[PDB]
Design a binder for this molecule. Structure first.
Ligand SMILES: O=C(c1cccc(O)c1)N1CCOCC1
Ligand SMILES: O=C(c1cccc(O)c1)N1CCOCC1
Lengths: 262, 265
């Protein structure tokens, strides 16, 4: 992987692995989201990385929202190239965008965007800026707007409502295993995407392809928490999703999916 | 990745990924087992397979894992490059064996080794059968003919008999179930998921203060997509030893048994 000529974005190539594909022998949306996270980590690493300013303040970047649109899922053995960049959005937070491409043809096979907010790692309270952490970041971001989803009032910025009971479909009693944890013993953001899709009926998965997925992160699922995945058809097939704690029904995530008939 | 000069083994390099590491910022045993499976699939692909022979596809016969054995000396760190060499060898009518050697790409030192026993099973009836001569000759050409063992030792751990855990279990993780991410391209639970489920019943105190050195796992019965699993563990022992049992949450039907060896950090 490497930073581009201007040093303001990062590109990396990935060979699709045998255990990374589904029934269609193409990459799952969860494999894709893992590769977005990987090329994001390598981008931060290549530019010197959270800044030392927020390291002392005990401030961390946390995902508020993930949005992913796939046109073609890379096949097993194919090479996919992902380009990623970050950009400030004022005091609100930061945005990381991605573009997925076919390595052989150069065509765009997918695109993704994510909204990141600042949080005190201990108190879990949001702080927005605290002092002047903007200046530390602006040097590694393009200063002119560079959007993976430029369309005025696009899908990535749509408000998602709360699913009302009774849910049409459900997957209950879902719980993380050690493989679902990151290097800090926190549940991986991609696990929540898997849990959302568990309540999608197999008939849909087998006859449709997942085109769009938007997910709002509201609360962290702990290692000892149990999750319930709810889904209701809103319609191509459209769905409304809700992940909540199995006990008190405390919301952890909400989202929408768009599926295209094969 | 590529076949070696003699064309009788395959090598591939892997950069350890950020989401592939644990608390120590080194590759999990599950990430390692996924890479053993990947370099195995690429070896079959490079020699013409799509790893069933012409005769096996005709007879609805498939290769199935009977046992996996893995020994790790050093877990590759996040960002490190690990090189894995794999080869297959027939063991007469019993079946075949696939072995692996993991190495540090920068120093060339051996950081791990693994072996697995594969048996032939009819895809539809789930009935095992010995390897016929016509199938045997089809894959003998892709195997070294002189013995090449990742575990050559006389009283080696890779071939030790594993007993059945007796209730009450000392530790337990109950109600474990596969999600879509745990399935392969044929909607069958991935062999690595069973390794994860075995380790779920290991107390966190052990995971945090010890490193997993050896793991041997016998595959007895396939966990279906709608099955629920219970993970049991009992300490058998500077080193900690464990006895494992994975069984169906309902009737207690055995799906796997195994042992782990942990060394204090
Ligand atoms: O409280 C969290 C959060 C914190 C850590 C992990 C997690 O999945 C969620 N958030 C509320 C709004 O801001 C973004 C998400
Ligand atoms: O019953 C199985 C089996 C089959 C498929 C998957 C699985 O996890 C186990 N076997 C017969 C005995 O030898 C080992 C293989």
């Amino acid at each position: 992987g490497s930073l581009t000529e201007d040093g303001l974005s990062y590109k990396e190539k990935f060979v699709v692995r045998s255990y990374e594909v589904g029934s269609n022998k193409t990459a799952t949306v969860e494999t894709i989201a893992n590769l977005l996270q990987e090329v994001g980590c390598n981008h931060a690493q290549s530019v010197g990385f959270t800044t030392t300013t927020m390291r002392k303040l005990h401030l961390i970047w946390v995902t508020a929202r993930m949005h992913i649109e796939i046109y073609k899922y890379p096949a097993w053995g194919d090479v996919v190239e992902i380009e990623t960049w970050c950009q400030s959005e004022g005091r609100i937070g930061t945005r990381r965008d991605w573009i997925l491409k076919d390595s052989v043809t150069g065509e765009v096979t997918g695109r993704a965007t994510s909204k990141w907010v600042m949080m005190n790692q201990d108190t879990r309270r949001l702080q927005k800026v605290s002092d002047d952490v903007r200046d530390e970041y602006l040097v590694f971001c393009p200063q002119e707007p560079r959007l993976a989803f430029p369309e005025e009032n696009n899908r990535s910025l749509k408000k998602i409502p709360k699913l009302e009971d009774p849910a049409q479909y459900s997957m209950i009693g879902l719980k993380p295993r050690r493989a679902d944890l990151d290097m800090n013993q926190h549940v991986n953001n991609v696990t929540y995407i898997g849990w959302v899709l568990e309540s999608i009926p197999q008939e849909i998965v087998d006859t449709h392809e997942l085109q769009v997925i938007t997910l709002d992160y509201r609360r962290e699922c702990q290692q000892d928490d149990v999750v319930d995945s709810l889904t209701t058809t809103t319609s191509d097939s459209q769905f409304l999703h809700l992940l909540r704690l199995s006990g008190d029904g405390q919301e952890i995530n909400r989202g929408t999916t768009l599926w295209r008939k094969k």
